[PDB]
Symmetry: D2
Subunit: 121 residues, 4 copies
Amino acid sequence: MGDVNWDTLQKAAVAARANSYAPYSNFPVGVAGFVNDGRLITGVNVENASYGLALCAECSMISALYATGGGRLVAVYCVDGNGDSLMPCGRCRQLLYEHGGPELKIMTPKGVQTMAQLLPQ
Amino acid sequence: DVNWDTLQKAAVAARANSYAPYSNFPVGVAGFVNDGRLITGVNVENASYGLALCAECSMISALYATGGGRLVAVYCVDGNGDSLMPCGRCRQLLYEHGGPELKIMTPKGVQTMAQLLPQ
Amino acid sequence: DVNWDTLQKAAVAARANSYAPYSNFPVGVAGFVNDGRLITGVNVENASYGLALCAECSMISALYATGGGRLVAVYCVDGNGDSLMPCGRCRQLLYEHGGPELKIMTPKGVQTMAQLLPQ
Amino acid sequence: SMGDVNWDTLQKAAVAARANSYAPYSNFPVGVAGFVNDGRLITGVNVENASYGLALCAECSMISALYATGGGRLVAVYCVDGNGDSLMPCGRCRQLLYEHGGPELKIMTPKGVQTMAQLLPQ
Ligand SMILES: [Zn+2]
Ligand SMILES: [Zn+2]
Ligand SMILES: [Zn+2]
Ligand SMILES: [Zn+2]
């Protein structure tokens, strides 16, 4: 009781994906996270006709973090169109690190890793 | 039939949750969606400046979280509660999610997206 | 004066080095700096879409690499060599480095930044 | 030994390029310099914007130079701050570098040379 339920994150990222705006890649992504108060926040990717103005699902999740009063990320699970875990892109790694620190857990294809190991400095 | 005052009040309230430690320039934004619901966003900076998210980026994220639709009016405010013009990046996002008819409060009054980003 | 044919050829020429494997939509841009020198840029996309650099972003980098200055005229082209409008984000970059009196070729003719990004 | 990366050359080149840096919003100027797989030296400076999130990192500028001069693959990169000390690429830039140099790209870091495989595990 109190351990991260990666399954809850997975299923929440999957459901969030329903709303993905990715008509340029046709590659919908969902993400879900636990904040340090135990609440669940989600994001989706949002693409633009100009490719460099697209927002990663994780970006939207960071926006949801602050919309709902802030805090710190503790656990994050990004999913593709099949529900499989996705590795965050380097940009999202930096956003994740800033709002999670080195101890943030990320679900990856090779299991749970920390931001300490995904973004060494 | 936009209650522009409800938008400014909403954007000011949203603004409390702003993450701008680097600039100390917090921003909030509120918008109406074509079904009438009110969404808001706040800016979220990053130690790497080019990673920062405008408040309108957040509102767009919130647009989709809450099931999509088209933006119909938007109001961005500064730490004093005064209208802010969206930057060029944010103009392209709003064009994309509201089209040319979307209305935006500006320092000099209401302007459509057609006027703010001519094509 | 400004020679617009020289920029459109220089842009097209530059477009050859485009890195656009994701959109298959290569872009070139050419512009004059206030000291008469000609600079170009191409788009460079990325597996993570939102990390793509626009042609105009590349040119802006070329501007500073080559010693600074203000942009005076700019011509962006698509794969056919036709004038392309800068995206809203690039308008904000152009404005920062050319100001309101910077001229851009558009499908409809020369327009200034002041027109294309009202403040 | 002949053909090893000369990190001195990269560091001096990055200090030099840093003089054209446009950083009025942070007052944190950055220069970067790279060897391409044909041996040519490229550079980049950061370019800030009134909208913070439209800022270009030094590594972005260098990537644009890579293509402007004919493409190729990055082989070694040295980023510098205002004191000429080694600087770590932010996350977005590690993603650009990865895409144009792959896992075996060498980056100089405060703790010595590291590869992109080490800096951005996949
Ligand atoms: Zn990402
Ligand atoms: Zn903006
Ligand atoms: Zn652009
Ligand atoms: Zn960077």
